[PDB]
Design a protein around this ligand. Structure first.
Ligand SMILES: Nc1nccc2ccccc12
Lengths: 110, 378
């Protein structure tokens, strides 16, 4: 438990915070995806309504990617175990959200 | 306000102001000393610079760049047709002239290359006004030495459309030479070589400076050779390494490749100050954490032919300028890629131990000289 580790752990707390902010946008898109599928819109209008969400899903994908690129700049030595665990869990969370992002893409602009 | 110096680069543009006996390189709204020469068109807005580049993976077909490769050129130009292959956006014919075609606010809209470069210049004018807190109209805009009458007039028109009073259109190698005050240097005529490796292009120029008057003696270099080629060789090395270490091919996972590329781009930069670079990319491909390293020596070997290949246009420039390598008074380094110690060593070894001009940031050297010229013309 070195002080120099708190610098790295704080960086990861800010990165985790930023991930929650992107995760909130993904959840709103999910509420709109389900919102069109179980909504009042006519069949032909639904296809357009679903595809209009394409800019936002690509925006959410890009943001998660920029977060990964930032996590990928961190050099965490072997002793910094708590920081390597936070970095593994955050990368895994972002990648599970990216799989959810891809699921939304599969259900739109078909 | 005062007059500014603008380097209107292919990938990144740069703006400088001469103040308090020194050139100050103006930072943009995102805090960057260079602004990407990018223009994005969307359903709701037109983005310029960093904002345009940040959404390039979201809206590739409607994000324009490399307009400098099209400005003042004919549609049927060999350069135009060969670069069209790599652009996600559309380049269309309009009575022999190229236009960029994009979807903007729901409708199909076309723009001339100088209309796009004028949006990029309006941004650099704004950047300068945001720093100085004063209105900027007067500017010195740089162009490469090989640019013709049409290519120069197109750039001059891009400044006119941007609301600038273009004080002068000057050559990039001349600007870099002004930055090092090679024209103030006492004595007879000075034969100066400019080594420009940066901004996706490579240009070797030979100048003659006699009593403040510059003369272009020769121009050589590869139009499509830069930092991106030195990155590829590192990316290939790592994909081959992951294959040996884990028997997995990451080359088809676009996101994994991008993660490796970004780490490679940074590791390259580190190898200019350090001898070793370290990469740690968790769950790169199929949950596999990629923990690796790359020495400066290794990077140099992977790019050995490419780095050496920078001496071919140096020799071709000397042949064409009818000069011996011993007859060169000054060597100037410009463009981010000149930062590589091997590039500097090979060029210094070739010139039998002559000290290169490398103090001024290679990314900023052309804007530095343009800012001196803007203050001289005022
Ligand atoms: N080291 C290095 N090599 C090429 C381009 C660069 C750009 C900016 C900083 C460092 C660079």
């Amino acid at each position: 438990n070195s002080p120099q580790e708190e610098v790295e752990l704080k960086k990861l707390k800010h990165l985790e915070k930023s991930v929650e902010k992107i995760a909130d946008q993904l959840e709103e898109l999910n509420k709109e995806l389900t919102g069109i599928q179980q909504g009042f819109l006519p069949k032909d209008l639904q296809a357009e309504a679903l595809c209009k969400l394409d800019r936002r899903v690509k925006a959410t994908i890009e943001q998660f990617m920029k977060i990964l690129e930032e996590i990928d700049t961190l050099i965490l030595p072997e002793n910094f175990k708590d920081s390597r665990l936070k970095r593994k869990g955050l990368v895994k969370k972002v990648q599970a959200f990216l799989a959810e992002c891809d699921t939304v893409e599969q259900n739109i602009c078909q | 306000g005062p007059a500014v110096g603008i380097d209107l680069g292919t990938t990144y543009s740069c703006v400088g102001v001469f103040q308090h006996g020194k050139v100050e390189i103006i930072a943009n709204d995102q805090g960057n000393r260079t602004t990407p020469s990018y223009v994005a068109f969307t359903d709701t807005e037109r983005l310029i610079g960093d904002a345009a580049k940040n959404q390039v993976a979201m809206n590739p077909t409607n994000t324009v760049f490399d307009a400098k490769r099209l400005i003042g050129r004919r549609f049927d130009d060999a350069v135009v047709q060969s670069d069209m292959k790599h652009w996600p956006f559309m380049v269309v014919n309009d009575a022999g002239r190229p236009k960029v075609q994009v979807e903007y606010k729901g409708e199909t809209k076309s723009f001339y290359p100088e209309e796009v470069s004028s949006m990029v210049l309006t941004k650099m004018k704004e950047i300068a006004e945001a720093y100085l807190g004063k209105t900027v109209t007067n500017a010195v805009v740089t162009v490469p030495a090989y640019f013709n009458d049409s290519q120069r007039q197109a750039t001059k028109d891009a400044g006119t459309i941007a609301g600038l009073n273009v004080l002068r259109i000057i050559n990039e190698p001349t600007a870099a030479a002004i930055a090092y005050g090679l024209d103030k240097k006492v004595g007879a005529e000075r034969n100066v070589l400019i080594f420009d490796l940066g901004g996706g292009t490579f240009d070797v120029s030979i100048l003659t400076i006699e009593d403040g008057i510059f003369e272009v003696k020769s121009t050589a270099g590869d139009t499509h050779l830069g930092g991106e080629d030195f990155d590829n060789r590192m990316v290939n090395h790592f994909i081959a390494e992951f294959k040996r270490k884990h028997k997995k091919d990451i080359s088809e996972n676009k996101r994994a490749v991008r993660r490796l590329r970004t780490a490679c781009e940074r590791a390259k930069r580190t190898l200019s100050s350090s001898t070793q670079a370290s990469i740690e990319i968790d769950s790169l491909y199929e949950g596999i954490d990629f923990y690796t390293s790359i020495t400066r020596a290794r990077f140099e070997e992977l790019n050995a032919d490419l780095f050496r290949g920078t001496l071919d246009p140096v020799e071709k420039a000397l042949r064409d300028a009818k000069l011996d390598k011993s007859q060169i008074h000054d060597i100037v380094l410009v463009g981010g890629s000149t930062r590589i110690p091997k590039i500097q060593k090979l060029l210094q070894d070739f010139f039998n131990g002559k000290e290169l001009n490398k103090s001024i940031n290679p990314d900023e050297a052309v804007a530095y000289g343009a800012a001196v010229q803007a203050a001289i013309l005022s």
